[model samples]
Target chain A: MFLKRLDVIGFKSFADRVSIEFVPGVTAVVGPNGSGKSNITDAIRWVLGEQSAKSLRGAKMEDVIFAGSESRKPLNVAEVTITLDNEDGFLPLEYQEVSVTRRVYRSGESEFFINRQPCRLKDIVDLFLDSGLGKEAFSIIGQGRVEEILSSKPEERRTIFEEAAGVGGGSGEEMKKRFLTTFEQIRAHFGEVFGELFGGGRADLRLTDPNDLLETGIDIVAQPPGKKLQHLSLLSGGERALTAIALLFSILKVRPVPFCVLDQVEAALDEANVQRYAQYLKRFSRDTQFIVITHRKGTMEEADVLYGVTMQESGVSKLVSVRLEDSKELVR
Target chain B: MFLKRLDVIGFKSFADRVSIEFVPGVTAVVGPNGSGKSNITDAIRWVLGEQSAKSLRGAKMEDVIFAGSESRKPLNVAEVTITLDNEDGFLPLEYQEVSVTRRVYRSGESEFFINRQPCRLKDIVDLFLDSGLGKEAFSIIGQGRVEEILSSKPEERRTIFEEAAGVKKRFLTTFEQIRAHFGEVFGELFGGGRADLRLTDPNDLLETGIDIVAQPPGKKLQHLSLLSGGERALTAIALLFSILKVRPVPFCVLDQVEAALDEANVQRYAQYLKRFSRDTQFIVITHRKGTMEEADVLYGVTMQESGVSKLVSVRLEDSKELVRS
Candidate 1:
């Protein structure tokens, strides 16, 4: 299953109706600063049942509505509908194509619909639970979110590993062994990836307290040449970015999400590291649909489809899309 | 009382000992990206008892320690000392200049110091009570924090006004008056600053009932949840100004708070900063020319050598005269 398209109306910055179609392998969204590119990511998060207005970059749920421009009047209602192709029966829905819609009004009233029929927010949330496409899942990484994952406490970081491990229903001993084995595999993968990304370095994942079977916390111990093993927190900005990319790649290897959305996760990376990141993303795209929002040419050149978000009208966002193959034809 | 100097050792990118002095008026820190300018603000915050490592842009307390670079080795401990000129007796202490210090080791053991004497974190915290300087106080606006103030519920936003109003002693009785007065003062200031400011009663919402009603210029007097990105940022600025109006802190530190604002809004914000600088020392970290132009003193932070932060100071007044000549 894959995301087919997104339909937005009266959403923030999208004062008018707008539709975005998604391809399977890789889709890159590029725009100038404040052109509402991040708004697209937020809309996807909101339609998937994100409850926090703060998470949506708004103070209240109603703030998602287009608050109007100098000439346009404020919209009383905001609506977003996400269409997903479910021919593979990945969504548990009977329809070949499923559309999930969320609408909010200025009066603070909210409604959710699945296939144009009213449904509970819980219903929408449950549909994407194990499919690795929920708002809170590790599937979506917003702007400046890479630092958040690296800055998270060991216990907090364990949640991603748990999700990737798929340790939901198992006996106590079996669960413990599964977690240990999964962690070992991830640790080895992380070591190899980190070594390649940084030129000469290896990362080791250790449990803060191995004696405590339950609630085990992770610690990333890094060993660069001529340096002793140290915590991830001790690394420089560039080093931290490389380590985080390695960890993200390891997670994808362990459990590939149906699709992943990355918003400027490479802003801190250098040109060389970005090439490495772009290459790794292409390698992983075989199993996972990747929607990347970036401004770097290195990442954009690797895209199968390129989308340019522009504010042609004041306080409004418009999309201009091009297929790489079609663009190649023009060049030819 | 005002901040005098900050001495940082082995913190973030400042792998070596560095000292930064403050003046009585606006002092702006300017630098290119990755120049370690924000490390100064984080150092001040960490020394002043900021507990959250994430807020400091690190994974843990140990993360703040100067991680080893290719040329420099990681320090076993990190230390920061903040000196305050307390001649006004704002602090309970009798000293004319009081120094507070905080240090942490790789083992996670931490210690606090007052005037070179060891002390507890609580002692340092109590010294700044009602002085309008704390980790959560509106006194320090870190990068990407302007939205946090506006994104908060009305009741949560009221906490800043409450702190400014000094209503801690009379919580229940003064709460009603504080809310009303806060709204009036905020509306008046915002209206004077921008003609589009609108306000309405927000007593109807439940689950954290509203305390202050504010709307951006040309926007309705709706809940904060309804404001746009620019509106949210402007509303937060209006609220910050309100706090400064009610009770001005000795000094305030702003870290790239204007990054989200347009040129027009940034000019307005800089204008307000100039006005507030009359009573409070403003230490701003910015790259915008508008904000930098309003500064009396400017410090340029640069990383000439990797993992090392260097500072250069220039008086803007002198620069302005030079430019005029």
Candidate 2:
């Protein structure tokens, strides 16, 4: 058991307070496009500890606060809290169940709390160190990010690899040395994962300048079964998106977080492809809890608990009840 | 009476030959995300002589050809032919019906023909010189381009304005003349074909050089600063299609230019877009229902055979009623 619950209010379009309960297995949030389903993902990522406003899809931090609508006035502040099941003492906190809170006001004031006690943002980050739940962790990923691995230059791509390797330990020779050791592990995992995701394809990671490991760029060599081997960028749209997910899984294997949030990461795939993807999510859910914000019906069938999101009132998001396969569980 | 028909074969995921007819009003192509809906848009752009493979979402030119699928083998060549109703002699062709064909073979051979008669690539370019169907025309606008005006530098943004103002005229001082006329074009785009004629006073017009009078409530009555996100996109969008009205093209293709925008704005966009279809034929590539309902004809592209795209067109009766009123 890892994630327990999330509490959000005055955040983005969720003008009213919202509470979401989580279990150890898979949970799915379904909604129409522009229904603000991803706001829940951003809220989770924010409560976990996120710094960049742009990464949060805003020009400034204040943009996360509800900007009002015809029916409601603007919210002056935004606040979110995430409760985690730390019964195993994975977190350094003295409490068995720990909760983290981050609050922001319109006057440029931000506050972080650990179990209702005032704490520094740095303190919250330190609490998550080595737990793979920090700001640097791949616990939550945004949309339009699937192309970064395919589109980035070889030199720029290593930063993601370095993050998995935890290059924060040291710099220069030390970081390069860690990357070399880490790359081998990921390279091994990548080929197997890529095949599993693609069903029959093979993929490999190579270096542009292996002679200069310090500045070397990483390149992807991909073969989609019957298709000829080519760079990852050359693959078709669905192929590229699937290939990037394979890379995402490879990274998660290296640094497995307790729970992960995927905001429509498999959106580019057709029904046949997304069905296979949901099954793979089940295999991973035994270890890591997943909160999938999705639009596909097939994905909803695989969820242990399902929640529906809608915009009954324009620019305002509200939660609705969702029924899952075999009447598994319906929640608001 | 402008665009007549488009025929495509082996282009992208369109393995089987696909044909589309255009009436003088709104036309829509709708499909799921991976149904090769935009492939039709690319076919139009390529046949009109698009040079960059990257712009067409490919690494190289050959990538435009359909690669092998599970059930079908790849073709050796990809071909596209666009037929136009040049009945009014708007085009420089002697024939009343002008059709342009462009073909590329996997073995690196390419050909261009005008009305079944082989011609140089230059011939097609010259034929569309004043017709506003050439590569340089705003005959088509792709996705994520609405932000180019908002995100681009003030200097870089002027080039698009000049493109509509016919930037081909000259340089520097002659450039400012284009800038002055841009105010009028901006007015037309800002309104839905309604003209404000607010070209500032003659003395002040010279200094206005693309300056936006912001007047955003929180700030002073200002000039081009931080427009809201949706507002900026609408600004760029207005500026983009504003070019078409300036030259008045016979047809235009819009490929999800409103994808990441607000629906309310999409409503306003489709509203303005309908007016252009008065003189210009518009083939809109969209999945949004806001754009779909406004269509006189809708072609639904689907992957019915797995990796193959087939078209199913509906002549909406309500669409006829809407377009009329």
Candidate 3:
């Protein structure tokens, strides 16, 4: 149980207050276009201290507030509170449950609170430092971001690996050594998982400059059975997406996060690749919770709970939840 | 008819010879992943003089060649040929049909041909000038490129409007006047279209600094970069439509450009494409059913053999016949 509940008020498209409950397993958010499914993901990112307005798909922080519809007036303040289940002591908190809230007003005033008590934004960041959950964490892959991960230079790719190794705070030599040790472990894990997911492919991480380990370049090379070992740049769009998924899973194997949010990451993939991705999500859901926002039926079928977002009235979003087991029983 | 056929060989994943036929109306190309559907679009762009390998999703020019698999060997050269029906005299050629071919070799050598006669790459580019079919033309919108058009600054956004105004060549004397003229034309077109399409506009704010200002339905005018993703995409479509209204191209090629759009927007895009197809040919590469259902013909690409692409075409009329039988 990573995220127990999310309460949003005066946020984009959610002109009225809305509450969404989360379970321990996979909970998928599905809706038609412009129905505010992505707002849920944005709400989570905002509460976790995401400071970049552009990363939130806005030009200014105030842009996240409801700008008013035909019938409704613009909101003066926007607020979101997220509840976390800390029973396993995953967070650095003494309480069994922790609720983090963030509020922003159109007057450029903002505040942060922990369980209704005033706290600094830095406090929230420090709490989730090594928890594999943060605004810049690899756990949150937003829309149209697959290309960024695949198109970076080899040296630039090391940051993700370092974050997965949980050596982000350490200095020069220690960080480098931990990265290398974790690299070998993740390399092997990637190979095994790639083979399992892709039938017969093997993935490897190579150094562009073998002599310089300190600033060595990283390259992701893959070879499907009966194919040549080629750089990720040579792979097709679908192949690149699958390779990114493999890298993501390798990171999770090294340092598993309590929950992950994926937003339309499979939009570029075909039906077959989506099936493989869905299967992998199921395999990983035992330890980590998944909140997938997708339009594909292949991903929707794997959900334990489905939340349907509908915009019956223009500019206002409504949510409806259905448990798969309950739906099946009703069908019987 | 605009494009009559496309012949590809030795190109990416197209190890064997594959030919695709095009009709006058909407033609969609559909395929599974790794099936080389986009290679067809890239081949056209390459033949039309696209020099950037990054835009083609490759590291080097030679990367476009079909890299061999375990059972096959690498090819020394890659080739693509496009046949155009010149009945409407769209091209400057006097012939009824024209064939443009581009071949690249592994030794960093490239060649362009017209009807099997060797020619310079400039010849092919010059032929498509003002015809709205160049590699850099606004007609060809590739994958993941919706953000680029929307995120650009206001001044940079003027390039598309100028191109649509057919003033790309006369940049010396009448540039200032042409800029004002095109701006007003675009403003009117955009304002009228947005009203009909349920999109917003700031037409009065257009002439402030010769910029393109767009806002959501109820919001004030802001820079296009400030708009939301969905809003940006809608504005981009409006820009594309404004271009077509100013200068209608003979054909347009869209490669998965609507992957960023939602179902409602996709439906609108498909309907607009259908309306525009009456005046121009559309060769769309898409996975969305909304767009596919609007196609007059469909081409399905498959990779039955490793490192090779095969084409299977279906005319919607013929499919209708099968269903009736």
Candidate 4:
């Protein structure tokens, strides 16, 4: 199953309903800062039952509603609906397609739906539980989380580190077994992907105190292509970012998430490493549906569909989409 | 006095000698990350008698020298020389041109020169004191410091907060002076950039806290409980530039402090740089072509040979050709 479309209205800067279509491959969203590129990323997670307001870049639940602009009125309710193509019966549902909807009102009220039918938020999660489209899923790496993973304190990164392994809080033997097996797979993928991304680098991830397994800190070492070995904290900006990208791709590869959303994760990379990143995306696109929010030209060049988020009026965001195959050909 | 040219060899990634000449308004430096764009900024700071190696992105002083790559051997000594034009007599030196050279050996020894003659590091600072080019100077702002000054804590921000006021042992009065000018410059940059100052306890003005918060840009005018970190970095930089606006200096070094701004904001910001440049010369290091478009000379740093940085400069006529989308 894969994400088919996303509908966002009155959410952050998207004052009007923004209908974003997704095909089988890669789609890129481009915009200047504060142009609601992130709101789209915020849309998918909310529809999937995201509970944290902070996760959606809001102080409180009501903050997600359109707060209005210079010449616009504030929105009372913010709504989002994500449709999934489940023709393969991947979701264990009777329908060929399934959709999830979420809405938050200015009065601090929240609502949820499954396939346009009234339902508890729990019902939405129940349907996509094993489908990898659930709220329990990973792979939607925000730009802030991306940088934090590379440099933040171990405890700060612990939640993310444990989640990528996709195990914890289970019974004694169960949690450790799943974590060790999965983390080892992710490590191998990291070494493989790091080489692919850096041309010839090797990366290593390890636990600080293995005896205290669940509470252990994580550290990584990167020997960038032809460069000597160095800890992640000492790496250059581009190398550090690329290393961070490699780690995320490693988890997504081992976990094999069907669709992935990356928000400006490649912003620090230059034109050269930009292509290296895009080429990796092209390969990942074969089995995984990808949505990337980027301002880099190389990422735009490789997109199957390029979506531009612009503000014709001060705070209202509008989208412009282009099919790049032909524009990718001769004429724009 | 304004910076004229910088010569560097065996310093950081500029293993081979690289010379960069600066003009008045704005001189843009462009390079992909790790191509040694920051090395140039460090060179300018180093030649001016900076004693802190940590300030130069090094754990120790000798780390400033080229450590070499896979093919090259490490150099024993790193050298940087900055030439300044004193034709206007802005500097106290007798000569029309003043050159300051600093060298550090891998052995931890150091040397300093004035006009290529042997001199103490103190002598270099003696000439640059009150020149706005001293190590005690506040304008050669690095990218890390820019973000830190913005959201780092009221207590942590006090140094930058107080320094910008350019007062405080004198106290109270100048804080009012900077607060007034900050609002005007912040307005020029627009909201978020249009920051407001709050005295945590207005009743106790002397011992009261100076609380700072920003209005969210493009959204409704309101104080954000927690602004997005990325967006606030811009506000922090705006606050920084506003500080520069209140007080004038000879020239400023901004090492890609404008990196995260959008094209629209970048255009507005580059325009402000022009207006501010009528008095203060600016040396901007950036990857954005929009910033380069606002420059008189553009210097492109590149790794033509891996781990070695090369420099190429162009006038406004050809700079557009140098930067690509």
Q: Which lDDT tens digits does candidate 4 get at residues A226-307?
A: 4445335435667778888888788778766668888777756766677888999988898889988876666777788888
User: Per-residue lDDT tens digits of candidate 2, residues A1-332?
Assistant: 79998888999878888888886788888754455677787887677777877667676888888877656778899999999988888888879889999999988799999999999988987888667774422667665455567777888878778877888335677878889888988888889987887777689999889898777899888776545453354455567777878877888888777888777676455455677778888888898888887655567777888887767784577885577543231111
Candidate of highest lDDT = 3
Scanning candidate 4 chain A in windows of ten residues, the lowest lDDT window is A323-332
For residues A237-291, could you state the per-residue lDDT of candidate 1 as single tens digits? 5466678878877777787667889887775554556777788787778788888
lDDT per residue as tens, model 3, A49-147: 888887777789998888776667788999999999999899888899999999999997999999899999898788777777853437787766755
Tell me the tens digit of each residue's lDDT in model 4 across B108-199: 88889888789998998777766655322258877544566654555444455455544334334545565676676666765443566655
lDDT of 3 at B309: 76
Q: Best candidate, TM-score-wise?
A: 3
Worst 10 residues of 3 chain A by lDDT: A323-332
DockQ of all candidate complexes: 0.08, 0.13, 0.31, 0.32
Model 4, residue pairs in steric clash? none
Q: What is the TM-score of chain B alone in each candidate?
A: 0.83, 0.81, 0.81, 0.86
Per-candidate alpha-carbon RMSD to the true structure: 7.6, 6.9, 5.1, 4.6
> Distance (Å) between predicted and true CA of A71, model 1?
5.8
lDDT values, one for every candidate? 0.73, 0.70, 0.73, 0.73
Q: Per the 3 Å backbone cut-off, how many clashing residue pairs does candidate 2 have? A: 4
Q: Compared with the true structure, what per-residue lDDT tens digits does model 3 show for residues B150-217?
A: 56654445554456556523322223443334334333422322221111223322222234455444
What stretches of model 3 exceed 4 Å from their correct place? A168-173, A224-226, A322-332, B167-231, B315-325
Question: How displaced is residue A3 in candidate 1, in Å?
Answer: 3.7
